[model samples]
Target: GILVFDVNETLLDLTSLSPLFERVFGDAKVLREWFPELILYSQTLTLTGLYRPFGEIAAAVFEMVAANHQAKVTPDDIAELKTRLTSMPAYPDVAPALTRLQDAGFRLVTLTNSAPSPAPSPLEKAGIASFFEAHLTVHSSQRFKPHPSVYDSTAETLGAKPEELCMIACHIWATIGAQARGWRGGFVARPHNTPLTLAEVPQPDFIGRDMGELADQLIASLT
Candidate 1:
């Protein structure tokens, strides 16, 4: 049995903002810059002795990002962003790859920083939720990635060894952290994420050019 997946960039196409960003920032570049900052700020709350849901942090960051852009987007714009996110389409390969893995007999599941209830319903909406045995939330661990306890507790609860579980994420930092904590890790060569920064980190055990190939590799590795 193995755990797989990261929510935002791996399975889902975050181009939900393409139209809005193309209209506002004149291309997708602006959204790219604000998106990472928004995520970092949200994660910072956990690091700095405070904790809040990623959704709430998203609401806050959307406003700040708007301010950064010097635009006066309405409440509707924010709602649109959230709605698009919740309904973001799965990448073309996600369904086929998940179906393949399901047929391969691996016990598949997901761990995400997003809330498990209201937020994870989107996975169902996107038509791939059935592939996961559990749609886990960081709320369960009270912490986020790069936090040792968070990964440790997740594997413990699943009755899995660090060796049995491999976290597949688009973020190299998150995967590197998993490796540092003794879990196996894999990276998806997501279009937007640059090469990983690993001078001070141990390398993840596997790397795939994309999700479909990654699953194929896992199946090969485990067999």
Candidate 2:
């Protein structure tokens, strides 16, 4: 079975960026606001046929935030953000869960919105790059997650039908995207994230509090 994964917050701990946000914005909650807005604006750009690397989009968002607060964000602030993004550690449960899935003869791959260029991809920096057979990204498609084409293209790249693959992510919107594309989905219920409540959205095939739990459930169901 092919198990497609999301990068940020699903396996890697995004809370690693909290200190930087707190240092810059004087409140850690700025990260909470910043991330969704970043994704929103990225989608906005995508819909308008504008293309920008994920990192560049993040940099732009930082400047936008600084302008909104009348704060002067230095290049150093942008550098710190890039450093944190590329160097963040994986969550404690990630390694064992990935190993478990691989050992069970599952084909593991990551489909991230992050740029795939440059040396040492995010998975490599997180120390889990060895687990995935393919480090897929939206960079090739110039589109982001929750877009049906991204998921379809990933499925095609994996040499599998959309229904033959499963997408596992902490973001409910991602799960919705997979379901909409006729792929099974597992929701890794991380903090500050919940399943979508919209009546139109189908329920996820699995929902777990962490990667290990989701891995166990997926194995049980799939095997």
Candidate 3:
């Protein structure tokens, strides 16, 4: 069995970047505005059959957020943001849970919208890189997360049937996209994310408050 992770906010602590935003935009919560806007445009570009580097979209989205707040972002601020992106810490519940899942025979991998880096990757910097068998990225496929092709391509590359795989993400939309590709989904309710509550929207198979809870539930149910 294979478990694919969504890196940002799911396994990694994105709030670590808040101080930088707070300094730049006069409030720490600009991250809330920037992240979804970045996701919105990522999905937009994918749907339109156009693509840009995730970093570029992230920078552009930062500009939009700055404009909304009437703040000017210096090049140094942008550079710091890029450097800090790869240096984010893994959440407290992630490292041990990953090992536990591995001991139970579930293979670990990542399917992040963040592109592959020539430098130490986010996962590597977060100290969880060795826990994964592969680090998958959307940039290689010229699409972004929530794009059907992205998840389908992951299944293909891993030699897995979608049915045999699972996607773990803090963003419900990320998991929903994988579910559409036939994989089971796990939603980790990190600080700012929750599943949709619409009656017509099917929820993730596992929705846990943290990675440990999700790991316990997933192991019990699957094994």
Candidate 4:
């Protein structure tokens, strides 16, 4: 079975943003509010059949956040905050659980909507890069998730059908897109990652509170 995973929220811990937000905006709340908007707009670019560099979109959103909050953060601060993302820690369960999944004969791969360079570094740093047969970024596809094509391309790359492939995503919107397209899907409840209304898409095949639980669910499903 295809076991496709999302990189950032599913396996990586992005708590690195907290300090950056506190330092730049003088309150951590700024990031909490802005990040979803950044993700939404980024996905919108793909959803509407358009595209942009993830970093450019991120910078633009940070500017909006700054403008809204009257915060005086400079370009340097935004760049620095973005850099910190590459060095963030992995979720505690990522490495070991991946090892278990790999040994269980599952074909694993990463499907992220992050930029090319520094984004891969996070997966590399997590030291589980080897477990994934492929690490894909939306930049490579020139599209982002929740788009039917993006999800289909991901399954096609794995040489599997949508139902043969199960998407593991922390974002409900991403998972919902897969479900609508006949893909089996799982949701890992990443902190602050929101789900879309199930009225528009099928419910996920599996839901887990964390990476270990998710791994277990996959193993059970595959077995």
- Residues 65-119 of candidate 1 have per-residue lDDT tens digits of 7778786778887777777767778888888888887888887878777766544
lDDT computed for candidate 2 = 0.87
Q: Give the poorly placed runs of model 1, Cα more than 4 Å off.
A: none
Candidate 4 residue pairs in clash (backbone atoms < 3 Å) = none
lDDT computed for candidate 3? 0.90
* Candidate 2, number of clashes: 0
Identify the runs in model 4 with alpha carbons over 4 angstroms from their true place: 118-120, 194-197
Question: What's model 2's lDDT at 37?
Answer: 80
Against the true structure, candidate 3 reaches a TM-score of 0.98
Per-residue alpha-carbon lDDT of candidate 2 for residues 155-216, written as tens digits (9 for 90 to 100) = 88888997789999999888888889999999998888888887767989999988889989
Query: Ranking under TM-score, best-scoring first?
Result: 3, 2, 1, 4
| True lDDT of residue 35, candidate 1 | 71
Better of 1 and 2 by TM-score: 2
Worst 10 residues of 3 by lDDT: 193-202
How would you encode candidate 3's per-residue C-alpha lDDT over 1-45 as one tens digit per residue?
799999988988989999889899888988998999999999999
Clashing pairs in 1: none
User: In angstroms, how far off is 93's CA in candidate 4?
Assistant: 1.1
Residue 186 C-alpha lDDT in model 4 = 89
Candidate No. with top TM-score? 3
lDDT of 4 at 32: 74
